[PDB]
């Protein structure tokens, strides 16, 4: 228990993710299916989801940006041709 506060509620067939609708305090709120239904990573990783997203379990993995760059201009023209005017 932290937050996501509603029963366990109501997934449809052909389902991958898990979240879901209701209105709890006024505001509509995500709430929680069966802890760990089957997500888009069931027939790839295997499919554990709860609390609003997806998820995956039996293979975990990270990355990092080992690229990058900046830009002082992102156009040559240096104007907007929307006003057309010089």
Known sequence: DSEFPCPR???PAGNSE???YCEMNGQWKLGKFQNGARCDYN???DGVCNEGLCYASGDSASNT??????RR???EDQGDDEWDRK
């Open 18 to 20: 898990c979240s879901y």
């Open 43 to 45: 027939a790839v990783k």
């Open 9 to 11: 509620k109501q997934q």
């Open 73 to 75: 201009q992102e156009n």
């Open 65 to 70: 940006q080992n690229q990058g760059g900046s």
